[PDB]
Amino acid sequence: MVKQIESKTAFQEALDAAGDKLVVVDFSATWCGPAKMIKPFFHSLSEKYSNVIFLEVDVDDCQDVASECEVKCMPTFQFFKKGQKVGEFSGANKEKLEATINELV
Amino acid sequence: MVKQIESKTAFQEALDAAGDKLVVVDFSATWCGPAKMIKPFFHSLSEKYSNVIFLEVDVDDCQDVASECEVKCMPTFQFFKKGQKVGEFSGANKEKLEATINELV
Amino acid sequence: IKSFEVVFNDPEKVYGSGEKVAGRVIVEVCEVTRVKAVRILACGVAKVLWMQGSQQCKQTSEYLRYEDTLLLEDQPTGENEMVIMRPGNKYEYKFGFELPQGPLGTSFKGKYGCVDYWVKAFLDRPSQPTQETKKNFEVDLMAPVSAKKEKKVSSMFIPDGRVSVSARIDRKGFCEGDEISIHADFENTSSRIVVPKAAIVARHTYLANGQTKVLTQKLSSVRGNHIISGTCASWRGKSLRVQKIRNILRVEYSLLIYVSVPGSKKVILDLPLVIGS
Amino acid sequence: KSFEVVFNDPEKVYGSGEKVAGRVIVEVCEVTRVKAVRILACGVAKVLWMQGSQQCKQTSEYLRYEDTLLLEDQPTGENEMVIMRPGNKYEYKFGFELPQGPLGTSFKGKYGCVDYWVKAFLDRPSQPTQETKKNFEVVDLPDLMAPVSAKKEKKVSSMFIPDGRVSVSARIDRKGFCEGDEISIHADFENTSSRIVVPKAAIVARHTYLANGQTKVLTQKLSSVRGNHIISGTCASWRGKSLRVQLGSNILRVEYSLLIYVSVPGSKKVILDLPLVIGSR
């Protein structure tokens, strides 16, 4: 399951919430065709990989975290272990996303 | 009657074969309304003043008589005696015509 | 001089784009007059103006510049022979000109602008100052502008690939020196990498060689990050400067927001501006 | 590869005023960078003849129209550059109107011709400017050396001469003169009106030129004569009264008339207007 997210302090939280567990973040957007298409696939993967923490951030809602994280486009996905990014890619590609998820757990 | 001058020669002969008599010359053109208008009158006069000699000159037929006499427009009337000009005026004017005649016989 | 007037054939007419204005200048004098010429100028000038916060901001744009020297019908000789005018008769000079099709620039004949047409005729007389007679004739904006465009950009594996651009700015009217601030969303579900761009362009309509010409100048411009297939990106306050520029009737201005697409035609928004000083 | 001027109505004969429109159509077999696509469109007449040993020529421009073409995909305009791959047709649109007046009227006959055409220049990478030219036909809606002549009559009435009239007719030998020759005028004038009238003649020139942004016309009385006062109730004639013929490169053409008119005091002039061609040595 995927925690919607609305503040940088709410963001800090999850970075704690997950222990040693890798955490994937969809920086998404409402009006974006490709991010809308990938949302569902992002949701099911959260059902599968419950050893992993999924989160969403709306780039328009959190202009601030989007920037703290140099996000340029949507969907962009970023991966952390311990708190520090280890993965990240852009584009609505399910396969790449599972592939990266696995390939980083 | 009016005598038709056909040339510089005819002209000279007219002038000298005249006597002491008064010669009147209507410098004329066949396309000129005013010259056309006064022709019959010139002619009635010739029949009346049978002691005056009446010539006509076509300025188109004899431009040479015309320019030697310095005719500039038509009808122009010139008046002679012993080869020599004693009168002149221009324009289709019966009254003026009869006056000069009686004034210069 | 007894009377010098410009009179149109339909004195009650208000005129339209591409249409023909005609009539005459009529002159009567008390005493005889040597006249050196009668000449006409016809103009159209819209003038758009406003106060930013509380500042003097204004653009002027012409739509007619027409001049001719007029000629009495019974006076065929030419402009290097003066005419003798006399009491009694009433001397009549025809003129005829025909407006340009396209705008006459009423557009913001509103709270913000206004539009001046008229005809001056001039009487030139030896050792005199030319006399003149002037006769008129007839023929939001601080609201936000926003626009959108989509273009199918297909692929064997993405036969429904699209590219779009949706754009917004604060108003149509800007002072030299300002920043135009841009809000824009770009989508790219096509197989190409695409690049979004913007430029302010200047279209000078100018008088040259019997004409009738417009030249396009590119002023400030920016370029965004390339956008890979299956993504979107955004401008949020990304800003373009309005620079001063250095026989032209007017300059029309536009903001162009376009996404350039390799192998295909641009997807172009053209957003009209008004730009004053 | 292909570089072709293509009119929308390939068969039209254009009339004065109409507007001429088409496309310049550019096709390529390998990738090219284009600095500009331009056009110039002209219309010009040359009247040309021998006057004995010596040639006399008048040249008239009816249409001097230049311009740079923009493609729809060039929205940043023309100090910007284009990129031409094979396989699609590049179409540059162009238009203009024919001037108002009388146009030379497409000819290739005894004393010369009149051609209108459109020229398309192209400018590749680092190359000189290639060319294509295509004619179009034009039509305005008497032999140069035949005699020209006219007559006119006006009622100049009088309370005492109601049928008062002034009339003139004149003839000249040809219509074409070289600068320097004289025009020998044959004219007959009749005046049955109550005024004294004065016959006059004059060469008048209309210079058509480009001031901005227009085609203007400057008119100039260029040489004239004055006959004798013709008094009421008379006629008079010119027998070859003779009359000599003697701004910038915005000067397109000049048109000439011999005016032979009569002045009637307190009434309109009576005017014959005989057109002329006037060439130089």
UniProtKB/Swiss-Prot annotation, chains A, B:
It is found in: Nucleus; Cytoplasm; Secreted. The keyword Acetylation applies. One of its GO terms (cellular component) is cytosol. Keywords: Acetylation, Activator, Allergen, Cytoplasm, Disulfide bond, Electron transport, Nucleus, Redox-active center, S-nitrosylation, Secreted, Transcription, Transcription regulation, Transport, Ubl conjugation. Changing residue 70 to A: Strongly reduced interaction with CASP3. The modification N6-acetyllysine is found at residues 3, 39, 94. GO terms for biological process: cell redox homeostasis; cellular detoxification of hydrogen peroxide; negative regulation of protein export from nucleus; negative regulation of transcription by RNA polymerase II; positive regulation of DNA binding; positive regulation of peptidyl-cysteine S-nitrosylation; positive regulation of phosphatidylinositol 3-kinase/protein kinase B signal transduction; response to nitric oxide. The record marks 33-34 as: Contributes to redox potential value. InterPro entries: Thioredoxin (IPR005746), Thioredoxin-like_sf (IPR036249), Thioredoxin_CS (IPR017937), Thioredoxin_domain (IPR013766). SUPFAM superfamilies: Thioredoxin-like. Disulfide bonds join 32-35. Residues 2-105 form the Thioredoxin domain. It holds the Pfam family Thioredoxin. Homodimer; disulfide-linked. Interacts with TXNIP through the redox-active site. Interacts with MAP3K5 and CASP3. In case of infection, interacts with S.typhimurium protein slrP. Interacts with APEX1; the interaction stimulates the FOS/JUN AP-1 DNA-binding activity in a redox-dependent manner. Belongs to the thioredoxin family. PANTHER family: THIOREDOXIN-LIKE PROTEIN 1 (PTHR46115). This is Thioredoxin.
From Swiss-Prot, chain D:
Belongs to the arrestin family. It comes from the Eukaryota. GO terms for biological process: cellular response to oxidised low-density lipoprotein particle stimulus; cellular response to tumor cell; inflammatory response; keratinocyte differentiation; negative regulation of cell division; negative regulation of transcription by RNA polymerase II; platelet-derived growth factor receptor signaling pathway; positive regulation of apoptotic process. Keywords: Cell cycle, Cytoplasm, Disulfide bond, Isopeptide bond, Nucleus, Phosphoprotein, Transcription, Transcription regulation, Tumor suppressor, Ubl conjugation. There is a cross-link at residue 200 (Glycyl lysine isopeptide (Lys-Gly) (interchain with G-Cter in ubiquitin)). One of its GO terms (cellular component) is cytosol. It is found in: Cytoplasm; Nucleus. Ubiquitinated; undergoes heterotypic 'Lys-48'-/'Lys-63'-branched polyubiquitination catalyzed by ITCH and UBR5 resulting in proteasomal degradation. Deubiquitinated by USP5, leading to TXNIP stabilization. This is Thioredoxin-interacting protein. GO terms for molecular function: enzyme inhibitor activity; ubiquitin protein ligase binding. May act as an oxidative stress mediator by inhibiting thioredoxin activity or by limiting its bioavailability. Interacts with COPS5 and restores COPS5-induced suppression of CDKN1B stability, blocking the COPS5-mediated translocation of CDKN1B from the nucleus to the cytoplasm. Functions as a transcriptional repressor, possibly by acting as a bridge molecule between transcription factors and corepressor complexes, and over-expression will induce G0/G1 cell cycle arrest. Required for the maturation of natural killer cells. Acts as a suppressor of tumor cell growth. Induction: Down-regulated in response to oxidative stress. Its main location: cytoplasm. Homodimer; disulfide-linked. Interacts with TXN/thioredoxin through its redox-active site. Interacts with transcriptional repressors ZBTB16, ZBTB32 and HDAC1. Interacts with DDIT4. The chain holds residues 8 to 299 of 391 of the full protein.
